[PDB]
Amino acid sequence: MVGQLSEGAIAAIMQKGDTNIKPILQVINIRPITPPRYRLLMSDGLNTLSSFMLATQLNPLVEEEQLSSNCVCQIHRFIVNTLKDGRRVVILMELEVLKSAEAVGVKIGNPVPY
Amino acid sequence: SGSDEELLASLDENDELTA
C-alpha cells in the first residue's frame, strides 16, 4: 500500500519547494496549535513531516472527522513558506479526501521523520 | 520540523523576521 501514496513528495517539497504537484498523502494525526488552526503530521509513505498547517476554510473537514488520522487525501493547492532557520512550512489550501480513515484502517508502511 | 510558534509566525512573514 505504500504505492498508493506520493512517495518522495515530502522530500521534493522540502528541497525544490515547487507547488505544481498534487501529492497523495496519508494523515497521521492532527493537532490544534492555537479560531483553531490545525497542524497535521503527514506521510508520503517514505517520510513523515509535521510542518503542515490547514487553511481555516477547511476546518470543517477536521471537525466532522472527514480529514482524520489514517485517511488518505490529495492536495490540490498549497503554499510553501521558508523560515529564517531553514525550515519550510506547508499551508494546505485545497484538498480532496480520497479514502476515509476507516476505509484505510492502518498507518501505511513505516515512514520515518524527514 | 518547527515549533508551533514559528509555524504560527510563518502565517505573518513580518512576525517571522523577528521571532
Q: How far is A21 from chain B (nearest CA, A)?
A: 21
The structural domains of chain A, with segments of one domain joined by +, span: 2-113
Strands (E), chain B: none
The CATH class for the domain spanning A2-113 reads mainly beta
Q: Do A85 and B6 touch (CB under 8 A)?
A: yes
Task: Give phi and psi for A61, each to the nearest 5.
Answer: -65, -40
Residue in B1, B13, B17 nearest the CB of A81: B13
Q: Which of A84, A88, A114 to mutate to test the interface with B (most CBs of B within 10 A)?
A: A84
Report DSSP state, residue A57. G
Residue in A37, A89, A113 nearest the CB of B2: A89
Using a CB–CB cutoff of 8 Å, tell me whether B12 touches chain A.
no
The neighbouring-strand residues paired with A75 are: A95
Contacts of B2 by beta carbon, 8 Å cutoff, 6+ apart:
A50, A51, A83, A87, A89, B10
Q: For chain A, report the end-to-end CA distance as a whole number of angstroms.
A: 20
C-alpha torsion angle, residues B8, B12, B14, B19 (rounded to 10): 0
| Rounded Cα–Cα distance for residues A31 and A26 (Å) | 15
Task: Calculate the alpha carbon distances from A72 to A59, A67, A90, A96 in Å.
Answer: 17, 8, 17, 9
**Method for structure elucidation:** X-ray
Beta strand pairing call for A47-54 and A88-99: parallel
Report yes or no: A45 and A57 within 8 Å, Cβ to Cβ. no
